Structure formats: C-alpha cells, structure tokens
C-alpha cells in the first residue's frame, strides 16, 4: 500500500500524485517524470524499477551522461492528467524564454530510498512548475488534503516555495484563491517560533503559521533534513501537520477555523497546481520537492499517520552530490582549461574578476598565486567544496548575476550558497566539472576567457551550447603556488 492507496482507503483519494523518487501507488509502473538533455534536446521518461517501486535513477544517469538534464514533466500518477510542466509567466515573469520559469536540474537533489539512488527536484530562485488545466482538484470551499516531502534545509525568505492549489490565471485573484504548503523563512506575512524555516499555508495575500496573521507560537522551526508537510482544508477548517520524513509521527501545529480576516471563509480555490512558486508566479523562492499529492476530501489524522508511516518505511537518506576526481579540504590546486585552443589557460583572477589566463613556470608569482586555489569544505554543504584564493585568503569563488567573482566570505547564508560547488566527473571526461550547489543547472564555464556559472543553453550569452561540455571541464593540477 503506497500513500495514494492509503488516502484511497480513507475515502479521500489522490487527484494529483507527483514524485521523481518513487511510485505513490503500489500498482503504479508508468512514467514518474520526463528528462530533457542538453546534447540533442531530446527527452526520455523515468519509471519505477518495479510496480510501486523506486525511480530508475541508473536510467537517468545513462541518458544524462556527458551532458546536462532538466526535469521537463512531473507526471500525475493518479490518472487525472494533472502533470506539472514549466510554469508560465503570470503576475510576475520568470527569467526563462517568454517569462516562463526555469526547469529544475535532474541532479541537484540526490537521495537514497532504502539504499537505492533517486533524484528529487532541486529548485533554485526562478524555477517553477504548474498545471493550470487541472481535473478533480478541489475548487471553492471543497475539502482537500495534500502533503509533500521536502528538504527542510533548502529554503530562503523570498516568495514563495509552495506546493498545492492555486489560481488558473497565474495571477493574484485575492484572499482565499490559494491553498498550498509553504516552506521557508519568509516573515513578510506569517511566521512561527525560532528562526525558521516554517511550514505555512499560502491562502494568497498571506502565508499562515496558524489562526492569526504574523506570529503563531505553535508553528515550530523545522530541524529535519527531510520534512513531511501535511496540509488540509475544508469548510472553515484547515490544519498544518509536520514530521521528520525519516523518523516518527506527524505533530499538529495548527487545526481549526480559517484565519478570521477578509476573504478566507468560505475559500475560493481554483484547482490549479503550483510547485516552487507563488500563485501569482512569484519566483524568488528555493526548495526541494521529493514527492507529494493532493486529495479530494479532508483526510483523517489516521489516513495521514499511515501515509507518514509509509514515508518513514521508504527510508529517505541524503545521497552523494559528488562524482569524479574531487578534492580534500586543505589541498591547493590549479584548474586547467581543456577546451581545444585554450588548453594552456588556467582559472585565475584579476581582483574580483575570475578569468582564464596562460600560466606556466615563467609567469609572475603574482599570477601563479591568482591561478592557485585552496579547496575547503563547502560553505553551504559539507559534501561539496569552496575555492579559496591563495593570494587573497578568506575570499572565495562565488556566483553573482551568474558571473564568478572572488569575494570575501561575509558569513551570510547567501554567500555560502553562492560559493559552494559540487565536483562532477567532467562532461568531456578530462578532470572535473564544478556544479553550482545553489543553481545546479549551472557549472563553472569559461566564455571569452571569463568564468560564469553557465547553463547548457539559456537566456545569457555565456550559456552558449557551443563548446559547453569542453568549457565546463577542467583538469586538477598541482597549484603553481
């Protein structure tokens, strides 16, 4: 019995069931999600390895070898056709072609489920999925449940990392026109105890941590690396439940009346589905989605408790973000360019500008230090790495407007995320490619001898697909200094 078999048994069946990690029905063996690769722009689907089983991650690794992959579609396993696709422009434009939101990397969110590798949906700011043509989803004041298993440590305070019911126009049509899980440390509207992040409910013109606008004491800060967020809503009732998706039970952080403010009772739900964005296409948020559903009707505590027990038995554990040669903390390296015609150039810097330059045993000591990097434990992720300047200690390679800069560590979360890179076996097979931890669609990429955090295709000039594989591949060499 999968989560959707459990909801079904409670007479509150799934009407949308979305996972890149596993089947949510014991008898589901169809496509979980679709991949598109940058090498030829073709697509494939990933299914469970067994009916009711875990995603075929090895089939993703095969399709995505020596290239980059986007998740184009998260299929609805319920049969309602409620597939999640690239989110369209709305009240806000996204950063992608015609104001669409970015697709997620296929490889930003590696996990194992009971020891078996799978991939979640790692969503950087500007990433979003949507279905504005959804069937069987609750509308008006009709009862619904939902849950998502999310990364409790991947979040920001920008609007809005949501999963659930939103507006079919992708615009703000008012209070009560949304009911979606929120995860992050936004304090623009609601917040809970501590420093966050919180699970809140986006009802539009508000994230609610409970009955009141703003502070509600009973909504705790989330500790867990994997968080089960379970939200439900009916006729002037709604609840927030939270669990460690790896251990134990759901606790109820809110349950009772609609917030007693203009437009939240009755609700005006439109039945659209969003992931990673606000209802109005607010696209500043980040977070990671592994699995989730939306139901018809108001699930009992008992149904959700059984879903949580099943989630625990799926045994979510952090996967490896790193492949290829990789590094040790304290090692000093030079990174050689492998692109034919630039194979004597190394990653260097001129002040804050990270670039490539010819470096050999006759270069000035100045340039030798600028082309030498102390590798340290990743500032935002201890599996990955940060690249510290030899000539400027305490300064690291960080992306900013997708250009690589050498900036001083200012101790902030944002700097740490922008300065964390995950070594990957080079796309051209010569050494390492360095994937952005925070924007895993992007890699260290030289373009006109300057370093960018470039995507394999995209809206920036430095995202050119020409020579991408070569331009993101670097040999790890003894530091000049």
Ligand X SMILES: *[C@@H]1O[C@H](CO)[C@@H](O)[C@H](O)[C@H]1NC(C)=O
Ligand Y SMILES: *[C@@H]1[C@H](O)[C@@H](O)[C@H](CO)[C@H]1OS(=O)(=O)O
Ligand Z SMILES: *[C@@H]1O[C@H](CO)[C@@H](O[C@@H]2O[C@H](CO)[C@@H](O)[C@H](O)[C@H]2NC(C)=O)[C@H](O)[C@H]1NC(C)=O
User: DSSP character for 352?
Assistant: T
29's CB contacts (< 8 A; 6+ apart) are 23, 47, 48, 50, 51, 52, 53
Considering the rule CB under 6 A, would residue 475 count as an interface residue with ligand X? no
Min separation Cβ 410 and ligand Z, Å: 7
Tokens at 376, concatenated: 């340290």
SS3 307: helix
Q: Which residues contact 414 (CB under 8 A, 6 or more apart)?
A: none
Closer to ligand X at the Cβ: 65 or 257? 65
Q: Is 142 an annotated catalytic residue?
A: no
Partner from ligand Z, ligand X, ligand Y, none binding residue 425, C-beta < 5-8 Å depending on class: ligand X
Q: 412 contacts which partner out of ligand Y, ligand X, ligand Z, none, CB within 5 to 8 A by kind?
A: ligand Z
Query: Hey, which residues does 44 pair with through a beta bridge?
Result: 35
Q: Which is nearer to ligand X, 17 or 427 (CB)?
A: 427
Residue 121 structure tokens: 């949906």
Looking at residue 170, what DSSP letter applies? S
25: how many CB neighbours lie within 10 A of its CB? Answer: 23
Return the structure tokens found at 257: 């009346």
206 is in an annotated binding site: yes
Candidates 68, 86, 205, 428: give the one binding ligand Y (CB under 6 A).
205
The entry of ligand Y, ligand Z, ligand X, none near residue 249 (CB within 5 to 8 angstroms by kind) is none
Q: Which two tokens stand for residue 67?
A: 């290239």
Is residue 13 within 8 Å of residue 4, measured between CB atoms? yes
> Minimum distance from CB of 435 to ligand Y (Å)?
29
Interface with ligand Z (CB under 6 A), residue total 7
Q: Which stretch binds ligand Y (CB under 6 A): 16-24, 199-207, 211-219, 374-382?
A: 199-207
- Among ligand Y, ligand X, ligand Z, none, the one that 429 touches (CB under a kind-dependent 5 to 8 A) is ligand X
Q: Beta partners for 70?
A: 36, 105
Distance CA 263, CA 382 (A): 45
CA angle 21, 445, 64 (to 5 degrees): 30
Q: Does 470 bind ligand X (CB under 6 A)?
A: no
**Is 204 among the residues that bind ligand Y (CB under 6 A)?**
yes
Stretch that binds ligand X, among 242-250, 358-366, 421-429, 437-445 (CB under 6 A): 421-429
Tracing tokens 């008006």 back to the chain, one arrives at 140
24 is in an annotated binding site: no
Q: Is 369 an annotated catalytic residue?
A: no
CA distance 336 to 334: 6
185 binds, among ligand Y, ligand X, ligand Z, none (CB under 5 to 8 A by kind): ligand Z
187 scored as a contact of ligand Z (CB under 6 A): yes
Instruction: For Cα atoms 99, 105, 110, give the angle at the middle one, nearest 5 degrees.
Output: 150
User: 360 labelled as ligand-binding?
Assistant: no
Residue 223 binding ligand Z, by CB under 6 A: no
Is 409 one of the binding residues for ligand Z (CB under 6 A)? Answer: no
Binding mask 265-294 for ligand Y (x = CB under 6 A): -------------xxx-x------------
| Segment (H or E) for 289 | strand 287-295
Q: How far apart are CA 199 and CA 144, in angstroms?
A: 17
CB of 222 to ligand Z, least distance (A): 12
CB of 469 to ligand X, least distance (A): 7
Q: Is 303 in the site for ligand X (CB under 6 A)?
A: no
User: How far, in Å, are 146, 281, 376, 398, 437 from residue 415 at the CA level?
Assistant: 34, 25, 15, 7, 12
Which stretches of the chain bind ligand Y, using CB under 6 A? Answer: 159-160, 172, 178, 202, 204-207, 278-280, 282
Which stretches of the chain bind ligand Z, using CB under 6 A? Answer: 157, 185, 187, 195-196, 412-413
* Residues taking part in catalysis: 204, 280
Which stretches of the chain bind ligand X, using CB under 6 A? Answer: 65-66, 324, 425-426, 428-429
Binding site residue list for substrate: 202, 205-206, 279, 399, 401-402, 418, 446, 448, 451, 471
């Amino acid at each position: 019995m999968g989560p959707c078999d459990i909801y079904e048994a409670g007479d509150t069946p799934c009407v949308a069931a979305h996972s890149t990690t596993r089947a949510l029905y014991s008898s589901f063996s169809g496509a979980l999600y679709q991949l598109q690769r940058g090498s030829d722009d073709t697509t494939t689907t990933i299914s469970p390895l067994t009916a009711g089983g875990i995603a075929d991650a090895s089939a993703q690794d095969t399709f995505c070898a020596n290239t980059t992959c986007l998740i184009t579609i998260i299929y609805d396993q319920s049969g309602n056709g409620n597939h999640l696709t690239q989110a369209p422009p709305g009240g806000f434009d996204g950063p992608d072609t015609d104001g669409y939101d970015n697709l997620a990397s296929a490889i930003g969110a590696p996990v194992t489920l009971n020891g078996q590798k799978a991939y979640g949906v790692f969503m950087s700011p500007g990433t979003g999925y949507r279905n504005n043509e959804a069937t069987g989803t609750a509308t008006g004041d009709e009862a619904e449940g939902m849950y998502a298993v999310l990364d409790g440590t991947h979040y920001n305070d920008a609007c809005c990392f949501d999963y659930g019911n939103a507006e079919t126009s992708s615009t703000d049509t008012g209070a009560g026109h949304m009911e979606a899980i929120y995860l992050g440390n936004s304090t623009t509207w609601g917040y809970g105890a501590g420093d966050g992040p919180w699970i809140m409910v986006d009802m539009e013109n508000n994230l609610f941590s409970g009955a009141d606008e703003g502070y509600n004491s009973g909504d705790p800060s989330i500790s867990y690396r994997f968080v089960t967020a379970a939200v439900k809503g009916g006729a002037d009732k709604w609840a927030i439940r939270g669990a460690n998706a790896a251990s134990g039970s759901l606790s109820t952080y809110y349950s009772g009346a609609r917030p007693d403010y203009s437009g939240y009772n009755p609700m005006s739900k439109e039945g659209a589905i969003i992931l990673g964005i606000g209802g109005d296409n607010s696209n500043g948020a980040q977070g990671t989605f592994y699995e989730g559903v939306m139901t018809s009707g108001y699930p009992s505590d008992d149904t959700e408790n059984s879903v949580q027990e099943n989630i625990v038995a799926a045994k979510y554990v952090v996967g490896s973000l790193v492949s290829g040669p990789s590094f040790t903390s304290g090692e000093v390296v030079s990174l050689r360019v492998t692109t034919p015609g630039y194979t004597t150039r190394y990653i260097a810097h001129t002040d804050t500008t990270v670039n490539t330059q010819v470096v050999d045993d006759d270069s000035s000591t100045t340039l030798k230090e600028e082309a030498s990097w102390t590798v340290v434990t990743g500032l935002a992720n201890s599996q990955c790495f940060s690249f510290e300047s030899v000539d400027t200690p305490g300064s690291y390679i960080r992306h900013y407007n997708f250009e690589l800069l050498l900036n001083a560590n200012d101790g902030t979360k944002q700097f740490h995320e922008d300065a964390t890179f995950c070594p990957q076996a080079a796309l051209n097979g010569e050494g390492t490619s360095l994937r952005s931890w925070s924007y895993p669609t992007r890699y260290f990429r030289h373009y006109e001898n300057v370093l960018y955090a470039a995507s394999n295709g995209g809206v920036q000039t430095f995202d050119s697909k020409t020579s991408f594989n070569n331009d993101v591949s670097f040999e790890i060499e003894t530091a000049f200094a």
